[PDB]
Design a protein around this ligand. Structure first.
Ligand code: HEM
Ligand code: HEM
Ligand code: HEM
Ligand code: HEM
Ligand code: MWY
Ligand code: MWY
Lengths: 452, 452, 452, 452
């Protein structure tokens, strides 16, 4: 039915099949579908996730209007997601005023002030990171990074999102690790969205119950044992209250949505970085020299000395341009609206193809090359903040951005203070993106790790 | 799941069964369930249509807040209804700004000015009403009113909602009558609301297609033949334009929702009136004398002489108190709100039990008796407009109220100018309400019709 | 998922899309899809109605095995159909032993003995047929046949399937006609077969209730008024009893399934015949001369004189080859089986493309031409009864075949005894088949009717 | 709808609620619902799982007819179960001829001949059982049996169902243990059975994919490494072939269904036994003396010496009467049939309430007491094999019964050769059954373990 919408508005796009819409075209991945539509149709285009019209926009004014100017009034929420259960109280999933409240209640937790108090927690698990790596480096065996890096990203989440301290790699049998390790079906979510409500009254939760049952009680253990500078405690202090306080269940739901947002992003960006540092050894040396300058004698990184490292920042940012691991941003259009000369009707999903804008030859020279100088203070100013959006933009951007950048930077400083990384015969050169759902390598990153 | 809500808020009500909620209790009808809960639980109570929490309110302040003060801000829409298809553009079904627009676009059509121009159309089909009745009165055979009255209510709808002129009783084979006569499943709508969206992508429309296909083309015939003072023409003139104009499809959807709202209401109220006039012959005589006074020599009623008839008005109103044929009013609570001292959480349905307030001994003496003096100018002032609500109240009340009152009044004046109505041995005394869905008699009204 | 089946077996066919299978290819109609697959892939091919594998077979041995030899053992039922409700007791819909019983209980009703007793009923409504036609022939106005023919097919069904006698064209307001005239959504039945069971527990019946409620009571009126040689009475006599008797509800369900099978088939074949007789006037004259020979002085047809008419038989049969209005036959494969050298796995639907075999140049010379001599006693023997199957074949073939042939033949004899039929400027020459579901003309048949 | 069935047949039972049927009555558990209906309604009764009629039968003749005489003809399959995916090829889930084949293909694997070859595998993991227990016995800490016993039941399954050898308690990090440890929602399966097919086309498998993906490949590793006397190898030898061979996928599906059937049954019976041996210390001593007699000097048990132990057999059997952990047996009635004087219509589920027959005072004196002498050779003969059915009866009974009895007996001999078991203050005396789904203790069994 609703497949006639874009034709009437005169918006171009690929013709949709009945029921499926355009979803068959996701067979080369979201990344390649988006690049092709940018190429074929120019500045705007429309496709259909099943019956759901999606309008893609690439003009930086329009993007600003949607992400900033008309965020509260028109473009407040992302695509409706389910079946969720009580996770409807997670900030990323909540809508309209419930989100606005949740955002207000959680924002003091992610300030640079609070982030400086967490850096000694984040630091200690970098030590754990190196001593897991040195065990594989002294054994002359090429390293699968996602395992040592995956363990780091999960380690930092426990101790910051619940206060629990695990060497998940070597304390694998902690009751905590096993439950938090319970991190395809979502294509049917789309040809058959009418089925989400079925599952909701069936208590078929996308977040399994035993885990959510554990953390609820496990936080209700810690809440009633203190009664530490982790997200848990910063949230327990906020509900010691303007809007209402954060109910016990809501504080759990936020913790869980942090784990999810933080775990595989941090792991994948870190792997993407080390792949680039190994295939661009010059960039690696220059970074190691900066780390040794700011931190002589392999001094431990601190909040302030991290923010001192400009090339490290340049490497991280250039990597997040190549691999914006969320790939897209979305907002549901909640009202009939006109923006920067374009009528947009109610219920359309508006989408910003980050990946494709990050690799748009119209804004970047040699967009496939890993050139960190792009982000040099001399050249950084000629970058558009609505073209480069690895963490989104506007009131609903990534609230954990500052933390995620410190966290990865702390990982890298220490791992580069100790090791060098070289391609193995088993390294996938060139790295190929997973034609599948999330932004991750086809083949995992394997490299030789030697000890300075 | 959501069956714990009212307990937490400390709102009383009948305990719900899983999945079903309280729906098993509708076995004696909505009317008796509501009276019992008013009796058992006082001024507010909560029940569950399956999983859907419904909060009943009976304080006239609170009712005013919900229906008037916080209508636009909080309580704007009725229970979500489907699967509807294109009838999503009908004003009664549209929500929020789309409704606000539609209401603005249609309101000039229902003014007392426009109503006076339609009274000669409505009048001519009263003539048809009498000559169908005189045929059954000259044949010494007790009359089933819903047939002669049903034919009247449908007759007035055609000529006012599309311009077509049919003696539906004696021109039964008109292509128009057969399609418009395509006026249980809605209990499953409620234990299984998750199934509405299934039907929507299945084009399973609650309003069958051929009819809606006919009127679309049939209005697109009349629109392109004129290019008359019916609702159709008053709507064709409005789209000759503040909001946007009323799209061709939208004008059809309004016409259809008028037929629906107008047909069985007008038929049932008229039957309820004649049942009361026959079991209260004094009231009938006194009305016939008023009709003969204002209209000597059986003069034809006009707009102004109808508004002159105060007892006729008193009869109609007293009847609509006994039989408020919509029974309830509803608004979905769109925000967490507090009203007249009571927190009401988002997504609750708020409900005003009209029938039960209309028969609440706390506001009416002998509420079961048919006493039209209740509405005497002497006594009319001591009536609360939020207790007596046969047409609702506030910005979303019955937009066709003035028309519906003229229409029934025009029916009655003429039918009483000519006939008297007496109970037959087959009359159901006392009339019993249909324990089933809509407000209508168990047994249809049969009476003896004699000719003055 | 199940889209890999035919590849493994090495059966050719069009590649299916996910979820949809091959259904997009029905856009030129079942008839053209089948002819193309016969052309492209030879003697067997496979396609998918959504996830449902369908195997097409065209070898007359194989067809015999499926329709006859292994009917009871393997290929007993047609595609599961719903949501049906109590019509699960109709013989066409019942499965396995319940069907075998029903077939036994109903078979004496369709004998040539019983058919001769019904011919005077069928005859009288042919008279009604002519006098509806003569009214349009004396008015110099081209005739839409499906209206006069549709009225005939429905007339004969009432009086034979319930005993009721209506000139439906001129007694349109009979309570009986209106309910029996309550004779697209079935494509979703197939991409979403998982939804039939939903509707079943929702009492969403494909046969609406009021009709089925009427006939149940209306037969329970006639059953309790007699307690006539119609199907109703022949069924009331059978339940006056080997298997069990035919429950009251079952007798209704059979009556309804007869109406359905008999109404639009008889109407459409009759229209196809008259279209061919008008575009082949030679064939019409030769038939009129045979009718006048056997029946001199426009003598009324009888059972025996109908069976005397060999060219009339030749015309009817040749027409049913051109337009086999069921188009296909189907059986679900209930066991893993091998037949005439071919493994066929459980749950596959096996399909005989009648239309396409009826127009297969490999068995018919000039298959598009209307050549009734094909069925001449000289040439009739060289016809394969598993290639020509307008009524199916084997234990589950059309049980009402003998009746349907008499019925149409009786229509034609009388209408040709009185009128000649000539193409009008508004006749669609050449007739185009409806690219839509059932086998019927794109445009309805309009012709000039003159009076001998 | 179908809630009228038992009334018509004159079968008594609890009146069902719409949609839910009788399921609300499962709130005290299946065990108590069944005992109450046996008490209230006598020898047969009917209830409804939602719309699904279930007929309970308790006459031992009738039970024999259903389980034996008419197994192949009428009562072949259990309740249809889903959504399953490829596990449709598991023998317990397969139906009719596909089951009959699978049963034939797997039956040589469960002979007493093959069982004697596996006893040295089963034995070695009893050693592992004791040395896990001795660690908790030397630490003066009451033992949670389900952990040490759960680890035993899973240990024996790996090495016999795939050949893999793990001390799951102390090798917890084996890639094999973690995947095999991926062993509520099924009440909705029943009010909404119409939803199983939805999930099937959604690939929503009740057996998660990664596990089933692992074992498929992991067996395809072992199959292609040998190419040992485990079930895997005995099945690899069978497909080296009457029916067809066991496809690669089918052999996996059987292995998985063995794990499921074998894991929690063996763990729970073993816990039930040790609870009874600790609350009946006399029975424990008498068993320990028999074990020491047959096996002097704590000799290791063998196949033959296990079958020598008559009291050990008496203890096990008496326990399985108290706690028949499947609780019920079921067969779908596939045909209208009459059995031992009782019409049973097609599609009814027929159910044998094992638990309730095992505790029926009409067949057992003091049925709540743990009296192993019931099974003494003197008294064993007066036991009805259709009243006592811990493993079912007839062609579809528990195919792994002989193995399950050896397995538990081997556990017990060794654990009693070494330890004595005494109630702790934390022991739940009397043990209460879990009012929830499967037959297991409310509270897990904790006891003091001392070392002989
Ligand atoms: C390198 C790591 C990460 C990347 C690349 C990333 C990316 C993103 C993006 C692109 C968005 C959507 C922005 C928008 O819609 O405009 C987002 C949202 C969000 N992220 Fe991050 N993210 C990362 C790590 C984290 C971490 C560590 C947290 C820890 C708390 C976090 C918490 C959130 C939340 C709560 C939201 C939704 C905010 C809202 O809905 O108001 N993310 N992330
Ligand atoms: C005696 C006859 C009638 C009665 C007792 C009646 C009663 C009602 C009631 C109780 C409501 C809801 C009010 C609320 O929610 O506050 C309503 C709404 C409505 N009625 Fe009437 N009605 C009658 C006839 C008519 C007629 C003749 C029309 C012709 C146009 C009509 C058009 C509508 C519409 C469009 C609405 C919804 C308005 C909106 O959603 O904004 N009704 N009616
Ligand atoms: C010219 C008119 C008709 C045509 C072309 C036609 C065609 C067919 C065909 C092709 C089948 C399926 C045969 C098979 O699957 O092998 C069938 C089945 C059937 N027909 Fe006819 N039909 C006609 C009229 C009628 C009439 C008048 C009746 C009146 C009783 C009737 C009753 C049935 C029944 C009950 C079945 C299913 C039999 C069973 O399932 O055992 N049909 N028809
Ligand atoms: C003490 C342990 C066990 C108990 C109490 C138990 C009980 C049962 C029962 C009551 C049945 C249904 C019988 C019927 O419907 O008549 C059954 C079926 C079955 N069991 Fe066991 N079981 C146990 C262990 C095992 C084990 C260790 C296996 C290992 C292979 C196994 C394999 C099966 C299979 C395949 C079926 C279904 C047979 C078929 O459908 O043909 N079970 N079990
Ligand atoms: C769970 C949170 C949501 C709904 C999906 C996310 O998180 C994941 O994708 C986790 S993927 C995984 N599952 N299991 C394992 N090991 N990894 C995304 C994609 C990502 C973190 C970036 C943030 C954001 C919003 C914009 C997005 O695009 C998503 C969050 C906040 C979303 O609200
Ligand atoms: C209702 C009966 C069924 C299920 C469909 C039929 O009947 C129709 O198609 C009626 S179509 C219609 N609907 N409304 C109006 N006015 N016409 C078919 C197609 C046809 C009669 C030939 C017989 C058979 C079996 C083989 C078929 O192919 C069908 C019957 C017996 C089927 O069991």
């Amino acid at each position: 039915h609703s497949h006639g919408l874009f034709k009437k508005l005169g918006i171009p796009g690929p013709t949709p099949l009945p029921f499926l819409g355009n979803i068959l075209s996701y067979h080369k991945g979201f990344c390649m579908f988006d690049m092709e539509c940018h190429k074929k149709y120019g500045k705007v285009w429309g496709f259909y996730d099943g019956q759901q019209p999606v309008l893609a926009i690439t003009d930086p004014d329009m993007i600003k209007t949607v992400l900033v100017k008309e965020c509260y009034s028109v473009f407040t929420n992302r695509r409706p997601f389910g079946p969720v259960g009580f996770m409807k109280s997670a900030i990323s999933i909540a809508e309209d005023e419930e989100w606005k409240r949740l955002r207000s209640l959680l924002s003091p937790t992610f300030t640079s002030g609070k982030l400086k108090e967490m850096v000694p927690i984040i630091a200690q698990y970098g030590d754990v990171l190196v001593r897991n790596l040195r065990r594989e480096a002294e054994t002359g065996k090429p390293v699968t990074l996602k395992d040592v890096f995956g363990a780091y990203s999960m380690d930092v989440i426990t101790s910051t999102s619940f206060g629990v301290n695990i060497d998940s790699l070597n304390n694998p049998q902690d009751p905590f690790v096993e439950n938090t390790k319970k991190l395809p079906f979502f294509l049917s979510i789309t040809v058959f969205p009418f089925l989400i409500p079925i599952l909701e009254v069936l208590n078929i939760c996308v977040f399994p119950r035993e885990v959510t049952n554990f953390l609820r009680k496990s936080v209700k253990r810690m809440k009633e044992s203190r009664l530490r500078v982790d997200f848990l405690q910063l949230m327990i202090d906020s509900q010691n209250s303007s809007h209402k306080a954060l109910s016990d269940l809501e504080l759990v739901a936020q913790s869980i949505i942090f784990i999810f947002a933080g775990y595989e992003t941090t792991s994948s960006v870190l792997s993407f970085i080390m792949y680039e540092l190994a295939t661009h050894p010059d960039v690696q040396q220059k970074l190691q020299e900066e780390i040794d300058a700011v931190l002589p004698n392999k001094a431990p990184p601190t909040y302030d000395t991290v923010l001192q490292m400009e090339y490290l920042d340049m490497v991280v940012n250039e990597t997040l341009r190549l691999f914006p691991i969320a790939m897209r941003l979305e907002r549901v259009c909640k009202k009939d609206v006109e923006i920067n000369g374009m009528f947009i009707p109610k219920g359309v999903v508006v989408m910003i193809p980050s990946y494709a804008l990050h690799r748009d030859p119209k804004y970047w020279t040699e967009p496939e090359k890993f050139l960190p100088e792009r982000f040099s203070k001399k050249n950084k100013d000629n970058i558009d903040p609505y073209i480069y959006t690895p963490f989104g933009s506007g009131p609903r951007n990534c609230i954990g951005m500052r933390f995620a950048l410190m966290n990865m930077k702390l990982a890298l400083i220490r791992v580069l203070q100790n090791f060098s990384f070289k391609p193995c015969k088993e390294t996938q050169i060139p790295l190929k993106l997973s034609l599948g759902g999330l932004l991750q390598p086809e083949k995992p990153v394997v490299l030789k790790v030697e000890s300075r």
